[PDB]
Amino acid sequence: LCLTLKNPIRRACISIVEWKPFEIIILLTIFANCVALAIYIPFPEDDSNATNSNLERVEYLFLIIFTVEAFLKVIAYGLRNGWNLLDFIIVVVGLFSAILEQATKDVKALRAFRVLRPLRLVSGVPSLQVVLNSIIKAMVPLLHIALLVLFVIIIYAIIGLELFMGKMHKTCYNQEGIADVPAEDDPSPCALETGHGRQCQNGTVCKPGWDGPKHGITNFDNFAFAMLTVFQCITMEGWTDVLYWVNDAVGRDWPWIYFVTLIIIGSFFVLNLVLGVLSGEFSKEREKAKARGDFQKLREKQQLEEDLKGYLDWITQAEDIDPRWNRFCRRKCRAAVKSNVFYWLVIFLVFLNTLTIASEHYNQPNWLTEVQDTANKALLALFTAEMLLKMYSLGLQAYFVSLFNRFDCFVVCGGILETILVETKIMSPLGISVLRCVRLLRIFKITRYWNSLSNLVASLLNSVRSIASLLLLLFLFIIIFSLLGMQLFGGKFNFDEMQTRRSTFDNFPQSLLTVFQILTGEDWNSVMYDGIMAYGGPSFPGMLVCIYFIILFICGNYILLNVFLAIAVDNLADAESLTSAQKEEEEEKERKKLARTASNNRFRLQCHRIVNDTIFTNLILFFILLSSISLAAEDPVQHTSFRNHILGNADYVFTSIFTLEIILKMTAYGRNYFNILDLLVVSVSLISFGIQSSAINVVKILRVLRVLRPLRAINRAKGLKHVVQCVFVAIRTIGNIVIVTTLLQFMFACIGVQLFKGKLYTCSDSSKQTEAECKGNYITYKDGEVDHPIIQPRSWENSKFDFDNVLAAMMALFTVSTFEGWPELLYRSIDSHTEDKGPIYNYRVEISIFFIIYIIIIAFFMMNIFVGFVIVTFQEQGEQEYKNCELDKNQRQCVEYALKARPLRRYIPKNQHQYKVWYVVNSTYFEYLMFVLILLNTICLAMQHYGQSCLFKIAMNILNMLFTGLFTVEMILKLIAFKPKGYFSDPWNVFDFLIVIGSIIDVILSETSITFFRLFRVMRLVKLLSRGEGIRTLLWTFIKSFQALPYVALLIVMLFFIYAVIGMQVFGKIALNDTTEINRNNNFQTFPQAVLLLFRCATGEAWQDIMLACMPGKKCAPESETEGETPCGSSFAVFYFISFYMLCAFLIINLFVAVIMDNFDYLTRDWSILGPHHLDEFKRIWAEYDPEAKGRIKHLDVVTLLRRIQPPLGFGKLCPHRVACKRLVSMNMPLNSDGTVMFNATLFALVRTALRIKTEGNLEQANEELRAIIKKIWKRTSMKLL
């Protein structure tokens, strides 16, 4: 009993009264310890107050309590538990820190263990323990993804180390010497005159001796810096900063490949991998939950509540019948509610209330607020009257039994209280009158799929327990890391720079806000840089602290994806399935009612023969492609060029051929909605000729309308139209969530308008607190130097995104929900003081919850609901294939593999010396030696550092030559072992051969530059990825899935093309300028640059800033040619940049899930039972027993064949000459000769003996079944007939 020996009971009588009362006092002690840790405020440079001293005093009490508890629990038994060892080490480290603090007086750094005490609160309650274990157990399948991410990070770090090796160290120094790097405020790297980078064409010169872009933290100077930069880029946070810095230090044409490929491979592909693996795991758990019958409990309770709703009023209807005026009164009112007019009346009143609420804005007219107040009072009175009419008619038990009627009742009861409270001047309105807009969802009742939304809410209310437990786990994780961050960076974020940091760890609320901002992944690298500079800096011991921001980013973004996706998936796997269970009851029941009550020289010779043929079908597809290419190659920045002349003239013939084709189209038919489209587009193209001098506004909507050229090829490309149709179907399916999310967004926007109506204004200098004061000039000091003053004008400006009215609030909340620039908006809204005034530092921190709750509800919950709904909808679309035969989706594939299998060829040659080298090469020790040598070579490669010694470089070159020569030696022997005619018949052998000859030419060039071939040396490391079976199979299956669905990605390609063109035609002129989001690096001036900008926006880097930088009121380039001051730049940027972000993202969700879809077979596999992986090794073990594919085996070979098969496929460690061989020989094998039994026959016999066995005499049943529902067999199983 985990005790064995028992010491005398005289002092071990402790397990008697330690069950009920000793299990809770310790939990309260832990809670008090957490509160005390939260109260502690870290001061910079040993400062303190009274509260810190009191807390340090009570820490002694907590330590003695925990030590007494540990001693009592240890005298009970001599710690082996996982969660008790943690308590023991916590208490021992606490004692050590306490004695060190008492004796020596880093001591303080040692007490960072205190943050582990809240974690012990998990162990107290098993309800959180089980959910924590469920969260943890999902980490095992993602270890392969983690290893892949590590390998790609290492490879890209080495490649970037080779490419960008200390190049980011030259900048422009305006002063005659190196004093204060006089290059604006944030200097950028530059290149010398002989270089291809950026040269400052000013009075300044490019001179080396520069620390680096981000204080020397972001650069590929050595392996650690390069790896950190690659990770920070792969997290898709500030990768464009690194890209632009490299584009300034080196040329702009080469290094985009590195970052674009890194983003595509290490971010999008990895996210797809994670989503697929997690979806498979959740589907497996959902299928496992059927045995427990969780869905049965929800189903019975669903059909029971509707019984009570229709029965309580039924007996209430009996009360209304006279066997008093009261019953007559109740009868009239009861039928008044169920009149189909009262419902529309209350809907109209709700819409009127929404109209009244949504009409509030900054400095609204007085009559508007008077009508707002009187209409609000009238509508509140009418809604109270509606409440009274409904409650009296149905009754209290018949009213509160409805879930919705519990919502509007609370809404009215709280709204009247808030109304009176605001009326009596207690506080500004909170906004609780806005949630009356939820009742506007009652319109869905008339439409179909109202019950589908009700099923989701019912499932959520059923699973509220698990939802609360998961949210508690997330909150505890956030609290623990906030305490750790407060301990590590408490008061260390105070540098000399004029702008004090807002995202610090000074207080507990500030630490919570910073940790939440890091978890959302927005500007987390800035916090990491501040934390690095908080310590010594870019040195060896001052950089390790960066790992704190890595685990928090890795262990946090993971937890969310197992908290808000699972909740989204399971509660959507119930409701949909729930809606699948009732939707037959509403069909059979009526069927019960129905079953009772009812009882011209235009022919295919010279004008149409070569029209409908595929040749003409795909000949015009090439011409549509060429027309699109010509459209994409225009020059927007200049209106009159010879380049625009040829393409502006090449379309004249292009439209001439297309117009000719339309003549061939009017004769064939007298017309669906496709052959008009092109015609209509063609009908627009002729206007291009009829312009003359009227190019004022007609062409401004004529040239932009040319982007419809690519999208008319969907009709002529079968498969693309199918994908578009599937996309439209998915849109119509997801509308049910889209409308609800939009309504919730509108509600939050109204609340935000009520909160920050005009409060976000600020003046240029913080001294002036009103617009009247904010006038004239003021004096600002450059870089916080009292001796460097500059006059600057005083400006009274609003926020970039404000809450002045409902539309501005919706824009701001959208930019917040995209996680772009939300910390700045949060910290600007924190300072909002009064309706028309300026900001006060940290006036209301508590308003931050508004920006947090929203992010929890819209950003994290609604989006995950969206993704899970897409996943479940696609799964049910792929699952409804009504093929319910005997073989249940597994034996079908097993029999297919058994039929489509063949032994592998031997290729074991004679000429024993060649056979001797073949035996040497194939040995596993040789493969281990190669893996060791590859690791050594990549270690040598990952050792070069900036500022290295010349002898170091010579030694590295010598080692490179030695390793390369050894690899050529290995390649030659291999070649002689496998012969040139068979050595190259392997995907990996050709890969190795190209690298070796690619690593030789540059070796020759070393003694004679170009660095393209050097990178080949790194690529050999990818061979190490082909060693683990699971990761290799996962990668290969995902790659095949991507190969099988090209048109889904073609949709994203087409969307990128169209938008780009649109951006080139509209925003393609705006002048390039620094200190602006439109510069040499980010612009619409060329098609590749527009594509790069759109990729940047799809990644979501600073798109909310490019939108503002594309606003009207900009000058544009002198290349394009009175009134041209700044009349150049449109207001389309609101619809252009928002819609794109909502479209592209959706398309990506379409590409991910689909790729996941057709790959469920691997994702939900249950490797324990038989599967294609198990049957794969049969060929590998019979390859050496069959000279070729053939199909002829040895009768005696079965002796070792039966032994070599694994227990999952064959038999365990039992004796071979036993019932296994008896059953193998006793069954009905084909009636061939002694050893002329063919491979697939034996394979089918083995797979039949493994599972799915039947009585003798049913072989012909399998024979007819393998041709009825199983795919074609081509009469190839003649030798397998018996």
Ligand SMILES: CC(C)OC(=O)[C@H](C)N[P@](=O)(OC[C@H]1O[C@@H](n2ccc(=O)[nH]c2=O)[C@](C)(F)[C@@H]1O)Oc1ccccc1
């Ligand atoms: C890659 C994105 C920006 O390009 C898109 O356009 C997609 C269309 N938008 P999306 O919102 O991507 C953001 C989510 O990435 C999660 N993330 C990432 C790495 C990780 O290790 N763990 C993890 O949870 C996350 C941090 F939670 C975010 O919520 O799409 C999704 C929406 C819901 C669920 C999954 C993806």
Ligand SMILES: CCCCc1oc2ccccc2c1C(=O)c1cc(I)c(OCCN(CC)CC)c(I)c1
């Ligand atoms: C089908 C054509 C329009 C697509 C679309 O319409 C919506 C209306 C309301 C809410 C969402 C959408 C929507 C999206 O497809 C969509 C939008 C966003 I924002 C979104 O989240 C991505 C931004 N952010 C996550 C919070 C990433 C950091 C996702 I996933 C899907």
Ligand SMILES: CC(C)CCC[C@@H](C)[C@H]1CC[C@H]2[C@@H]3CC=C4C[C@@H](O)CC[C@]4(C)[C@H]3CC[C@]12C
């Ligand atoms: C059912 C709901 C969504 C309907 C709400 C629509 C009406 C009431 C809203 C939508 C957009 C709003 C406008 C948005 C912007 C401005 C500009 C501002 O200088 C005066 C107010 C004004 C003109 C708002 C008045 C109210 C408005 C017209």
Ligand SMILES: CC(C)CCC[C@@H](C)[C@H]1CC[C@H]2[C@@H]3CC=C4C[C@@H](O)CC[C@]4(C)[C@H]3CC[C@]12C
């Ligand atoms: C996230 C939690 C669970 C674990 C992460 C470990 C972090 C917090 C720990 C592990 C190793 C630690 C570092 C180890 C060594 C040094 C050098 C010293 O001169 C200052 C502290 C510093 C820089 C530590 C900072 C905190 C640190 C980075």
Ligand SMILES: CC(C)CCC[C@@H](C)[C@H]1CC[C@H]2[C@@H]3CC=C4C[C@@H](O)CC[C@]4(C)[C@H]3CC[C@]12C
């Ligand atoms: C599959 C689709 C997206 C491929 C589209 C390829 C076409 C549109 C691209 C590929 C290469 C591109 C060219 C590459 C380089 C330049 C030089 C630059 O000074 C003007 C644009 C110009 C001339 C580009 C025009 C557009 C272009 C021709």
Ligand SMILES: CC(C)CCC[C@@H](C)[C@H]1CC[C@H]2[C@@H]3CC=C4C[C@@H](O)CC[C@]4(C)[C@H]3CC[C@]12C
């Ligand atoms: C990724 C695997 C396979 C190879 C890389 C692991 C080892 C060899 C790497 C990891 C960290 C690396 C070190 C990181 C930092 C420096 C400081 C620099 O001034 C000289 C090189 C030196 C000392 C690197 C040498 C190589 C190194 C020790």
Ligand SMILES: [Ca+2]
């Ligand atoms: Ca960002």
